C-alpha cells in the first residue's frame, strides 16, 4: 500500500466515497453469501474454524459509526471476507467462485476511490 492509504486520515468526503464502494459491493449479483454473518445451519463447524468472521452488514455498521480512521483498516476488513471464504471452502465450490469475482470487482472500485482522493 502507498503512504496515503496507510497514513492519511479518512475525512468526511472520503467517508462518502467509502459508502459508495460498499453499496456497489452489496448490489453485485454474486454478493448474496456475504451480505450478513454466516448462519451456523449453513455451517455448524464455521465458527470453530474461522476465528475472525466478517460480512458486509458488519462493515456497514462500522462505516456508519465512523469506526475506520485510515483506508488500510477498511481494506483489511473487506479482504477478511474474501480470505475467510477461500480458506473455508474448496476451490471448486460456488462460494469460492463468488469470492474470486467479488474481490476483483472490489479492487476495480478501490482503485477508483484512491484516484479520487489524490486528485
- Hey, which residues does 9 pair with through a beta bridge? 70
Spatial contact of 91 and 68, defined as CB atoms under 8 Å apart: no
Pick the CATH number of 1-119 from 3.40.50.1240, 1.20.920.10, 3.40.50.300, 1.20.1270.360: 1.20.920.10
> How far, in Å, CA of 116 to CA of 83, rounded?
27
> How far, in Å, CA of 50 to CA of 101, rounded?
21
Write out the three cell numbers for 36: 450478513
- CB burial string 34-66: b at 16+ within 10 A, e below: beeebeeeeeeebeeebeeebbbeebeebbeee
70 half-sphere exposure, CB direction, 13 A CA radius: 11
What approach was used to elucidate this structure? X-ray
> How far, in Å, CA of 100 to CA of 105, rounded?
9
Spatial contact of 102 and 34, defined as CB atoms under 8 Å apart: yes
Resolution, Å (one decimal): 1.0
H helix count then E strand count, the chain: 6, 0
> How far, in Å, CA of 10 to CA of 55, rounded?
21
Write out the three cell numbers for 103: 474481490
Question: What length is written for the chain?
Answer: 119
- Please, what is the angle between helix 71-88 and helix 12-26, to 10°? 20
Quick one: which of 112, 83, 96, 110 has its CA closest to 30?
96
Phi-psi region of 66 (alpha: psi -120 to 50; beta: other; left: phi over 0): left
Amino acid at each position: 500500500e502507498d503512504a496515503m492509504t496507510v497514513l492519511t486520515p479518512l475525512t468526511e468526503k472520503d467517508y462518502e466515497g467509502l459508502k459508495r464502494v460498499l453499496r456497489s459491493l452489496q448490489a453485485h449479483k454474486m454478493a448474496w453469501p456475504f451480505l450478513e454473518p454466516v448462519d451456523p445451519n449453513d455451517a455448524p463447524d464455521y465458527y470453530g474454524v474461522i476465528k475472525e468472521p466478517m460480512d458486509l452488514a458488519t462493515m456497514e455498521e462500522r462505516v456508519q459509526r465512523r469506526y475506520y480512521e485510515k483506508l488500510t483498516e477498511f481494506v483489511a476488513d473487506m479482504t477478511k471476507i474474501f480470505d475467510n471464504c477461500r480458506y473455508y471452502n474448496p476451490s471448486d465450490s460456488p462460494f469460492y467462485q463468488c469470492a474470486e469475482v467479488l474481490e476483483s470487482f472490489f479492487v476495480q472500485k478501490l482503485k477508483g476511490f484512491k484516484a479520487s482522493r489524490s486528485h
